[PDB]
């Protein structure tokens, strides 16, 4: 049953799929028929973009877009560091010892 | 080695910065002990598109 | 995280004093904070951890031949029992793992007082995050769930729904008993304060309507309301409560 | 006002649903129970000692308490013969209870 | 670390560039060249996943202690 | 990693969310001013069953696909009607409207649980007629009505007597009784008939409704309206035969009008049927035009009386049966000059 | 040399081919893992990722094992 609702909301999601074309397809009383359709409908899944509406337009501000990300900026996420390189001529010979 | 952990713990919180351990999660064993949060989060990032 | 982010954008919301939430036109998103504070309160008292669980998760993913399928296993080589189960688990009393030892009864300014001596302490795990435990992470699921269920409770349609909804008064009747009698689950000191001062404030508004369910929670109401105050060292037990 | 506890029940009120006697009393009842339910949007928002708290300065006051007080457990240089004890009375507590106790036998 | 990285990778980039070097060891100097060159991208997809694994755990009442509700 | 670096990190980190809470400002003033911007955060949904996001911070609880509410659920009489779930009992339910002395036809048929207490009848009647593309003005051509037959229908529903309530016989017995159907669907026309033991529990209709629409390849009202015929005729004889107190372990069935409907004992020689009798015994599928089409619009109970399933389609697109108004299969809007 | 030998992670999800199909096709394609699925085949996206994370490339050339690294 559930197959069923599912595959025939998406060969057309424009079209609200009614309680009453699933019980008239499928073998099965009304109350449960009902009540899964209720329950798949509840969780978007069918019937979630029967009037689907379009975003204008984003006058889009800087650092709010998409490869709006500089190396200068902080990691207060991203564990990774950088390190600064400690040229020091000791810790030059250091380096070269170990 | 509680008054080391709770003094760079306290200078992490007070600087202002966040985040995971950097010693800790450059490891392999990190992501083999934590493999049941990156299987929901790879497909939560993946099925979203922005992986 | 679709947890997570539900229950940030409801405390903003909440606490907003501008933005109403009535449940009038949806009644559902209630039972649905009750069930969960529900089932939080239900494994904080058995230490399961959730949310990243290594089960499946899924169930059973896949007449006059029942008879002939029964005897298809013996001339190729040559009926199931019902089930049962509940929607909410068991309150939390009659859990084998709670049983009462001692009633904590600590007072007004002692928990102001080991609040303050907790923080002021230098090895204090107050600030330890919430990815780095998931005790705590549990722990500030349920503090923004009382949270928020105090913010819901300052409205007229809001307060007469909250009086019934049987999943609210099970909550309450759940959280009680374990900032009461096992309060040993939560992890910092001002979360079982904060508990305790937003269940009253959230009893405050809802007591005009409320039928108590069970006789436990009716002396837990009274532990709890006894709980702020201080006592003495019969007579009258109680000195006076001096309101600065 | 004071509307009623009639007026509170389910059936004189709306519920999610998919005459002029409750419509007056409902008039009362959220003219009354939005005046007395609704939270105060001025000061004391502290409410007590515990809410104001600060995690930053008290973070900042116990990272200099520890620091001073290990440098003064490892830095100074004191032997441990040569330490000091300190007075169990102050100079004015040794002269109070020279006081009482001579006025203990009355 | 960063000096033993790259005298690795200089490393196994002449175990392959020589021919007199057996190809059970030629090739598999290749994947080790390849699995060298390719760790800055694993640290940038290691590093985000943790990120939103962070973000999951943001709850508004760790990070603000004093948020007053009503 | 001194002092002197770790405070300027400071400082180049402090100027930097300066200028991010300068965008943040920057884009609420934006939408307080009624023009989309985007923030930091992406836009978070789109016009799909939720609504529009990027707006000025309203509530807005529910926004319904079409025009109805969601469907709360109970949950507490869901588990006490789930765990006390002894038997089904399907009620088979006709209904029949008219333009005299009702305004809409309705003609759809549809089985329905009697045990069944979690619906509320007037909710269900409620959501079909809204799936029927009726409008607001739906309670002078009332819902009450429609709810009323419905709720006659179900009282009537005496239930598998005690072939299935005291006694059954594995096997059943020999009555055997004469189906007929006639559906139509679209511009075909099914006439069938068969025998059916009304006798026997584990006779599954539905089991051979699909079957019968397996072999004939049926679209799929076939396989509702099969089965509901049989349950309908079954139950219009086990009616009439506990109104007329059958008694229904010893047969002795006594009667005159019943006795003749049913079918006589297959013996050795009857076990294969007569040529000129087998034509009637098969599924003709005919099809009919406009004239008839629109001669069959028009045009104790009584079992010679058996009424045929003509239903008024759904409107839906994608299902044979139904007519195809309403949002179509491309995806246009159409805004011309 | 302590050279990292990372075509032993051969467990029985993945194999040695599998293993070089992943890192020819994420050194052909960079980070679009439906092209690098495509390129190692029998195996989702979501597999990959994982395994890319999981891969213990310079835990060879950092200190310790799993006493303490200290401060």
């Not at chain 1, 000791?90 to 380096?95: I, N, R, V």
């Not at chain 3, 008879?67 to 929607?87: C, G, H, R, T, Y």
């Not at chain 3, 405050?204 to 409320?210: C, E, G, T, V």
């Not at chain 6, 096997?171 to 008939?193: A, E, F, T």
Request: aromatic share 10%; net charge negative.
């Amino acid at each position: 049953y559930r197959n069923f609702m599912v595959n025939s909301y998406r060969l057309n999601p424009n079209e609200y799929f009614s309680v009453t074309t699933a019980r008239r397809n499928v073998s099965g009383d009304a109350a449960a028929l009902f009540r899964l359709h209720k329950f798949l409908t509840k969780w978007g899944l069918i019937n979630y973009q029967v009037d689907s509406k379009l975003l204008p337009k984003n006058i889009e501000p800087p650092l709010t877009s998409q490869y709006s990300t500089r190396h200068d900026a902080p990691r207060g996420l991203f564990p990774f560091e950088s390190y600064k390189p400690s040229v020091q001529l000791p810790d030059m010979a250091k380096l070269k010892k170990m | 080695n509680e008054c080391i952990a709770s003094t760079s713990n306290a200078l992490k919180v007070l600087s202002g910065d966040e985040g995971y351990n950097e010693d800790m999660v450059r490891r392999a064993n990190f992501y083999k002990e934590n493999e049941a949060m990156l299987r929901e989060n790879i497909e939560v990032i993946l099925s979203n598109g922005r992986m | 995280g679709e947890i997570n982010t539900a229950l940030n954008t409801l405390l903003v919301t909440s606490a907003d004093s501008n933005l109403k939430i009535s449940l009038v036109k949806y009644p559902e998103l209630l039972d649905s904070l009750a069930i969960l504070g529900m089932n939080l309160l239900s494994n904080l008292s058995q230490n399961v951890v959730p949310y990243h669980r290594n089960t499946s998760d899924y169930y059973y993913e896949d007449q006059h031949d029942k008879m002939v399928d029964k005897i298809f296993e013996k001339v190729n080589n040559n009926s199931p029992a019902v089930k049962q189960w509940d929607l909410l688990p068991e309150p939390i009393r009659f859990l084998p793992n709670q049983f009462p030892l001692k009633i904590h009864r600590t007072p007004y300014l002692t928990s102001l007082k080991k609040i303050k001596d907790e923080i002021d302490d230098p090895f204090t795990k107050i600030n330890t995050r919430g990815a780095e435990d998931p005790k705590v992470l549990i722990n500030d699921q349920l503090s923004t769930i009382s949270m928020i269920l105090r913010n819901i409770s300052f409205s007229d349609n809001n307060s007469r729904i909250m009086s019934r909804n049987f999943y609210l008064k099970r909550f309450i009747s759940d959280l009680l008993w374990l900032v009461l009698i096992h309060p040993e689950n939560f992890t910092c000191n001002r979360k079982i304060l904060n508990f305790k001062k937003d269940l009253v404030i959230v009893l405050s508004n809802i007591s005009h309507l409320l039928e108590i369910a069970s006789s436990i929670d009716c002396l837990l109401i009274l532990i709890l309301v006894i709980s702020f105050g201080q006592p003495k060292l019969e007579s009258l037990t109680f000195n006076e409560f001096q309101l600065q | 006002n004071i509307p009623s506890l009639t007026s509170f029940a389910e059936e004189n009120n709306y519920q999610y649903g998919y005459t002029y006697a409750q419509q007056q009393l409902n008039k009362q009842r959220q003219d009354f129970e939005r005046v007395r339910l609704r939270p105060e949007q001025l000061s004391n928002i502290i409410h007590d000692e515990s809410d104001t708290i600060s995690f930053r300065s008290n973070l900042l006051k116990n990272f200099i308490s520890s620091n001073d007080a290990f440098n003064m457990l490892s830095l100074t240089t004191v032997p441990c013969d040569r330490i000091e004890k300190s007075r169990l009375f102050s100079e004015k507590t040794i002269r109070y209870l020279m006081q009482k106790q001579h006025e203990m036998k009355t | 670390i960063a000096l033993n990285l790259d005298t690795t990778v200089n490393d196994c980039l002449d175990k392959l560039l020589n021919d007199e070097c057996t190809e059970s060891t030629r090739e598999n100097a290749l994947y080790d060249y390849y699995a060298l060159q390719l760790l800055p991208l694993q640290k940038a997809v290691r590093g985000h996943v943790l990120q939103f694994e962070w973000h999951q755990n943001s709850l508004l009442t760790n990070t603000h202690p004093n948020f007053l509700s009503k | 990693f001194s002092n002197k670096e770790y405070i300027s990190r400071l400082w180049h980190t402090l100027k930097y969310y300066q200028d991010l809470k300068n965008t943040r400002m920057k884009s609420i003033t934006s939408t307080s001013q009624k023009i989309p911007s985007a923030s930091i955060w992406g836009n978070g949904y789109s016009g799909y069953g939720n609504g529009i996001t990027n707006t000025t911070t309203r509530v807005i609880p529910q926004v319904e696909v079409g025009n109805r509410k969601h469907y709360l659920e109970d949950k507490l009489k869901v588990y006490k009607q789930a765990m006390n779930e002894t038997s089904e009992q399907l009620v088979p339910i006709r209904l029949e409207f008219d333009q005299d002395r009702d305004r809409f036809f309705l003609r759809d048929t549809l089985l329905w649980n009697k045990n069944d207490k979690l619906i509320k009848i007037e909710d269900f009647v409620d959501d079909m007629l809204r799936d029927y593309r009726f409008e607001d003005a739906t309670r002078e051509q009332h819902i009450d009505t429609i709810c009323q037959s419905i709720q006659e229908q179900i009282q009537e529903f005496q239930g598998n007597p005690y072939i299935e309530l005291n006694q059954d016989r594995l096997g059943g017995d020999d009555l055997r009784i004469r189906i007929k159907l006639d559906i139509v669907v679209g511009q075909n026309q099914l006439i069938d008939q068969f025998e059916w033991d009304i006798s026997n529990s584990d006779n599954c209709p539905e089991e051979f409704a699909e079957s019968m629409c397996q072999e004939l390849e049926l679209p799929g009202e076939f396989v509702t309206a099969i089965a509901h015929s049989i349950r309908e005729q079954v139950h219009m004889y086990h009616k009439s035969l506990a109104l007329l107190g059958y008694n229904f372990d010893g047969s002795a069935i006594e009667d005159d009008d019943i006795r003749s409907r049913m079918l006589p004992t297959i013996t050795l020689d009857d076990v294969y049927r007569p040529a000129a009798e087998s034509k009637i015994f098969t599924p003709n599928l005919l099809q009919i035009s406009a004239a008839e089409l629109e001669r069959l619009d028009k045009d104790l109970p009584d079992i010679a009386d058996i009424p045929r399933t003509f239903r008024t389609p759904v409107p839906s697109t994608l299902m044979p049966g139904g007519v195809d108004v309403g949002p179509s299969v491309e995806s246009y809007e159409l805004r011309n000059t | 040399l302590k050279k990292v030998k990372i075509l032993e992670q051969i467990d029985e999800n993945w194999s040695k081919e599998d293993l070089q199909k992943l890192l020819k096709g994420i050194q052909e394609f960079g980070a679009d893992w439906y092209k690098v699925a495509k390129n190692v085949g029998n195996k989702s996206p979501e597999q990959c990722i994982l395994r890319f994370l999981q891969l213990p490339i310079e835990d060879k050339f950092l200190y310790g094992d799993g006493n303490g690294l200290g401060p």
